[PDB]
Amino acid sequence: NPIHDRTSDYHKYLKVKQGDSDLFKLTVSDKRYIWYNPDPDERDSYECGEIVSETSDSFTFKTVDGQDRQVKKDDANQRNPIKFDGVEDMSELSYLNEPAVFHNLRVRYNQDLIYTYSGLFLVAVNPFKRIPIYTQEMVDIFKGRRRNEVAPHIFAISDVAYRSMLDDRQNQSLLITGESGAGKTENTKKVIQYLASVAGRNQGVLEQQILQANPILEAFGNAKTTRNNNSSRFGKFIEIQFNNAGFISGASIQSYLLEKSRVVFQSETERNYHIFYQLLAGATAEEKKALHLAGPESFNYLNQSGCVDIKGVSDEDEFKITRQAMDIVGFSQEEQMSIFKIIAGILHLGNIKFEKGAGEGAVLKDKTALNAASTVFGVNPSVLEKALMEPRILAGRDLVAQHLNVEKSSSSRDALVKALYGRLFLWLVKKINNVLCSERAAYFIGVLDISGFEIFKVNSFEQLCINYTNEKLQQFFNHHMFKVEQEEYLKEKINWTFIDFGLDSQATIDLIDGRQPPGILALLDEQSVFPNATDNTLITKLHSHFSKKNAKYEEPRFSKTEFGVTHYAGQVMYEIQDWLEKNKDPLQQDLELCFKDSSDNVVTKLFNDPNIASRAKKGANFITVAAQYKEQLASLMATLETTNPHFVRCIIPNNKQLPAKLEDKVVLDQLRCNGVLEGIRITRKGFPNRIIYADFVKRYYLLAPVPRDQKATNIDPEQYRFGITKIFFR
Ligand SMILES: Nc1ncnc2c1ncn2[C@@H]1O[C@H](COP(=O)(O)OP(=O)(O)O)[C@@H](O)[C@H]1O
Ligand code: VO4
Ligand SMILES: [Mg+2]
């Protein structure tokens, strides 16, 4: 038993190293310590000091340098006894304080132990390096073990969810939180791997396909951002489905909010979606020929950030992986080819150069890019050109051709690319889901991997929707961990004295998505269907409604085009530029007519399938992006509310994507804003386990002298409470 064998990889990689003679000595010391701030300005940088004296209300301690300091016992952050250093469950700590919590995570991190329990949920600190803890052998160990019998691991939280599914015959969810680059997506992948393994029908196809969906989605939905070289630029809710038996019956992926604008624009040093680089790199010369491709430097859509490659990554090699995945998922050779033609057409489109013509309306002097694109997409070039520069619209009922200028024509070509891309993405997912749909699921374990909280020099509409989503997910944790928990206690009249954990994202949530009074999204929507609205009228309106009126909102004095929102993770300044267009998400209809006529089977679907091509209508207008997403999100949350949730809090160690470099301020801000300590305090202070008397009696009347057919209901009364319908236990 590797679990017992100090020589096992399990022991080696998942357990705290045996401390030494000396350590033993320090461990038995009678000395007492405190965590303190050598510099009170830097409240997150602590030192260890020996408590030398004490009064009824204070502690006197020595500082590093050796000097002595005094503190109210009240404000003291006592250091836990060293035997606690590296503890698997921080709820065991005697002293629950910031520096102590960070310390324990630091101890574990320093020996490559990235997983640590915080009471009922898991904390995962990104290592920024490979740790061999995810092998089959590793998986095998977790298999069916109680959380308590094994070390903290994403596999273990996965097993528990799985057991709870089968035990309670209830659906579950694995909610993995974190800011951008925290490790949500790596963890998610581990969750899937585990489930596939432990509930996989052995004798691995459905299962491998489930697995294989991954690289396809990431090649098309991930990109290098300044915070993450493999940033998920869309969110996903993966439903792992199981039959009555507990075997994996299927899976389903729901995608959210693809950052379509990345296809046409990328900030300095970032990348466009990986796929673009994989194709250019992994394409054959025969393919490169037929697609009229060159290197990324030859394309405006890939040659503006200053970055075409990611250290340690081989686009050409990933291309092969993407392709095999498509192969395993089942995409036909023809399908794949159309897929690449679409990518290639996008690239050429991007190369179209509009020029001012006669007067205002634009002209296209060189048709190379235009012809190349038309040729790969299987659409008519003149038709496409007219659709770009002179699209037709109704003026009342009259039909008028517009004559767009250089700026509008480019924006339109951009809009066409974005729709091509977003719809291709949706098609890839739908294609994947259809392959994976083969059973009327008895249960599911849903894994949520969203784009996490992010802040850039320029935060736009995409950032707002992302951060809003992260704010809602945090609220869901708050709700679950504290709101609902206490209500049960209070409900069951167990004499719980309500505690205010001080964590509440409601006000921020409301500021954003409130109806009445209207929040930011409501106002954006109103202005969005207002004929004379401009980004300027929009911002003015936001300010008029929230400036000096909403606590979570700020109208900055240093800018006229930005507004600030105070999220759980920090305040973010948003630039209003393009918001109406972004919310409206327009696309000239003549563009769509051009594409519905494509000789390409895939292109056709993107434009002809109402599942992909159709826009929903809200009265006299089509639905906006905001309303639409707000709705998707609300629906997600409702679904989650029907599951038994398990939280994984991913923690980023620093902002450099470096291993072995745990930054205290970095980590502490996350622990603070995620509600980690409060969450530990609740686990401690309260009563996790509870059972209705009758299901308790019925279940086991056997330990009894007691019938099977409440009050009657030895074991110690310290760890138990008597509720009004159930009894509670620790
Ligand atoms: N458990 C882990 N093991 C190894 N590397 C990891 C782990 N978790 C995260 N990483 C590293 O951090 C990077 C960002 O992680 P990721 O899951 O993509 O973040 P996000 O939370 O943004 O999804 C990964 O590409 C990988 O380099
Ligand atoms: O960087 V991530 O949080 O996958 O968008
Ligand atoms: Mg991710």
Secondary structure (DSSP) of 566-630 = EETTEEEEEE-TTHHHHHH----HHHHHHHHT-S-HHHHHHHH-HHHH---EETTEEPPHHHHHH
- Give the nearest ligand 1 atom to 186 CA: 17
For ligand 1, mutation pick of 122, 128, 270, 311 (most atoms within 8 Å of CB): 128
Q: Is the CB of 185 under 6 A from ligand 2?
A: yes
The tokens for 492 are 């069951």
Give yes or no for a contact between 449 and 184, defined as CB atoms under 8 angstroms apart.
yes
**Residue 648 DSSP one-character state:** E
Q: Is the CB of 459 under 6 A from ligand 1?
A: no
Residue of 120, 150, 176, 119 whose CA lies nearest to 13? 150
DSSP string, 435-477: HH--S--SEEEEEEEPPPB---SSB-HHHHHHHHHHHHHHHHH
- Residue 375, classified by CB atoms within 10 Å of its CB into exposed (0-12), middle (13-18) or buried (19+), is middle
Give yes or no for a contact between 394 and 312, defined as CB atoms under 8 angstroms apart.
no
Strand partners, 68: 62
What are the C-alpha distances in Å from 326 to residues 235, 313, 319, 434? 20, 20, 11, 13
The tokens for 23 are 């350590």
How far does the chain reach from its first CA to its final CA, in angstroms? 29
Q: Helix, strand, coil % (nearest 5) of the chain? A: 45, 15, 40
Neighbours of 332 (CB within 10 A): 12
**Residue 262 DSSP one-character state:** G
For ligand 1, mutation pick of 190, 230, 256 (most atoms within 8 Å of CB): 230
What are the C-alpha distances in Å from 207 to residues 46, 132, 199, 324, 666? 48, 22, 9, 15, 38
Q: Which amino acid is residue 510, in one-letter code?
A: D
Torsion 625-626-628-633 (CA) sign: positive
Residue of 520, 554, 662, 550 whose CA lies nearest to 113? 662
Q: Is the CB of 451 under 6 A from ligand 2?
A: yes
The tokens for 311 are 């250290």
| 288/30 Cα distance (integer angstroms) | 73
Give yes or no for a contact between 629 and 465, defined as CB atoms under 8 angstroms apart.
yes
Please, what's the b/e burial string for 580-617 (b: 16 or more CB within 10 A of its CB; e: otherwise)? bebbbbebbebbbebbebbebebbbbbbbeeebbeeee
Three-state SS for 476-500 is HHHHHHHHHHHHHHHHCCCCCCCCC
**Coil vs helix vs strand at 156:** helix
What's the Rg (C-alpha) of the chain?
Answer: 29
Q: What are phi and psi of 228, to 5 degrees?
A: -160, 120
Q: Which amino acid is residue 66, in one-letter code?
A: G
Q: Give the angle 122-126-130 at the CA atoms, nearest 5°.
A: 115
Q: In sequence order, what are the residues at sequence separation of 6 or more whose Cβ sits closer than 8 angstroms to the Cβ of residue 709?
A: none
For ligand 1, mutation pick of 126, 217, 655 (most atoms within 8 Å of CB): 126
| 461/521 Cα distance (integer angstroms) | 10
| 323/546 Cα distance (integer angstroms) | 50
The tokens for 125 are 């600190």
- Give the nearest ligand 2 atom to 227 CA: 1
Residue of 485, 159, 344, 444 whose CA lies nearest to 436? 444
- Residue 657, classified by CB atoms within 10 Å of its CB into exposed (0-12), middle (13-18) or buried (19+), is middle
Three-state SS for 508-545 is HHHHHHCCCCCCHHHHHHHHHCCCCCCHHHHHHHHHHH
β 355-356/248-256 pair status: unpaired
Looking at ligand 1, which residue's alpha carbon is closest to its atom 27?
128
Residue of 567, 571, 562 whose CA lies nearest to 542? 562
Enzyme catalytic residues: 180-181, 185, 228, 231-232, 452, 454
Kindly give the distance from the C-alpha atom of residue 469 to the centroid of ligand 3, in angstroms, as a whole number: 14
The tokens for 415 are 């809009």
Kindly give the distance from the C-alpha atom of residue 314 to the centroid of ligand 1, in angstroms, as a whole number: 17
Torsion 275-277-279-281 (CA) sign: negative
| 615/357 Cα distance (integer angstroms) | 34
Q: In sequence order, what are the residues at sequence separation of 6 or more whose Cβ sits closer than 8 angstroms to the Cβ of residue 12?
A: none
* Length of the chain as a residue count: 730
Q: Is the CB of 181 under 6 A from ligand 1?
A: yes
Neighbours of 422 (CB within 10 A): 19
- The alpha-helical segments, DSSP class H, found in 143-235 are 154-168, 184-199, 205-221
The answer to whether the bond into 517 is cis (omega within 30° of 0) is yes
Longest dimension (CA), the chain: 100
Kindly give the distance from the C-alpha atom of residue 472 to the centroid of ligand 2, in angstroms, as a whole number: 16
- Give the nearest ligand 2 atom to 179 CA: 3
| 498/480 Cα distance (integer angstroms) | 15
Neighbours of 168 (CB within 10 A): 11
**Helix 506-513 crosses helix 461-478 at what angle (to 10 degrees)?**
140
Q: In sequence order, what are the residues at sequence separation of 6 or more whose Cβ sits closer than 8 angstroms to the Cβ of residue 184?
A: 176, 177, 178, 232, 449, 450, 452, 648, 650
| 26/20 Cα distance (integer angstroms) | 10
Strand partners, 237: 254, 448
The tokens for 496 are 């719980």
Give yes or no for a contact between 172 and 640, defined as CB atoms under 8 angstroms apart.
no
Torsion 599-584-552-642 (CA) sign: negative
| 646/211 Cα distance (integer angstroms) | 21
Cα torsion 387, 341, 622, 381 to 10°: value is 10
Q: Which amino acid is residue 163, in one-letter code?
A: R
Domains along the sequence of the chain with CATH: 1-31+80-330+438-452+643-685 (3.40.850.10), 32-79 (2.30.30.360), 331-437+586-615 (1.20.120.720), 453-585+616-642 (1.20.58.530), 686-730 (6.20.240.20)
| 98/77 Cα distance (integer angstroms) | 8
Strand partners, 49: 34
Q: Binding site for ATP: which residues?
A: 178-185
Q: Give the angle 675-681-683 at the CA atoms, nearest 5°.
A: 100
Give yes or no for a contact between 476 and 484, defined as CB atoms under 8 angstroms apart.
no
For ligand 2, mutation pick of 451, 463, 466, 650 (most atoms within 8 Å of CB): 451
Kindly give the distance from the C-alpha atom of residue 191 to the centroid of ligand 2, in angstroms, as a whole number: 17
Ligand nearest the Cα of residue 177 is 1
Looking at ligand 1, which residue's alpha carbon is closest to its atom 9?
183
Q: Binding site: which residues?
A: 178-185
Kindly give the distance from the C-alpha atom of residue 181 to the centroid of ligand 1, in angstroms, as a whole number: 6
Q: What are phi and psi of 407, to 5 degrees?
A: -60, -50
Give yes or no for a contact between 193 and 138, defined as CB atoms under 8 angstroms apart.
no
Residue of 33, 31, 43 whose CA lies nearest to 95? 33
**Coil vs helix vs strand at 185:** helix
Q: Is the CB of 229 under 6 A from ligand 2?
A: no
- Residue 19, classified by CB atoms within 10 Å of its CB into exposed (0-12), middle (13-18) or buried (19+), is middle
Experimental technique, in short, is X-ray
Strand partners, 35: 48, 77
Strand partners, 646: 174
Looking at ligand 2, which residue's alpha carbon is closest to its atom 5?
451
- Give the nearest ligand 2 atom to 181 CA: 1
Kindly give the distance from the C-alpha atom of residue 233 to the centroid of ligand 2, in angstroms, as a whole number: 7
Neighbours of 681 (CB within 10 A): 17
**Residue 247 DSSP one-character state:** S
Q: Is the CB of 183 under 6 A from ligand 1?
A: yes
Cα torsion 536, 541, 547, 552 to 10°: value is -100
Q: Is the CB of 180 under 6 A from ligand 1?
A: yes
Q: Is the CB of 725 under 6 A from ligand 1?
A: no
β 720-722/726-729 pair status: antiparallel
Cα torsion 200, 203, 208, 211 to 10°: value is 30
| 580/625 Cα distance (integer angstroms) | 10
Q: Is the CB of 231 under 6 A from ligand 2?
A: yes
Q: Is the CB of 228 under 6 A from ligand 2?
A: yes
Kindly give the distance from the C-alpha atom of residue 453 to the centroid of ligand 1, in angstroms, as a whole number: 15
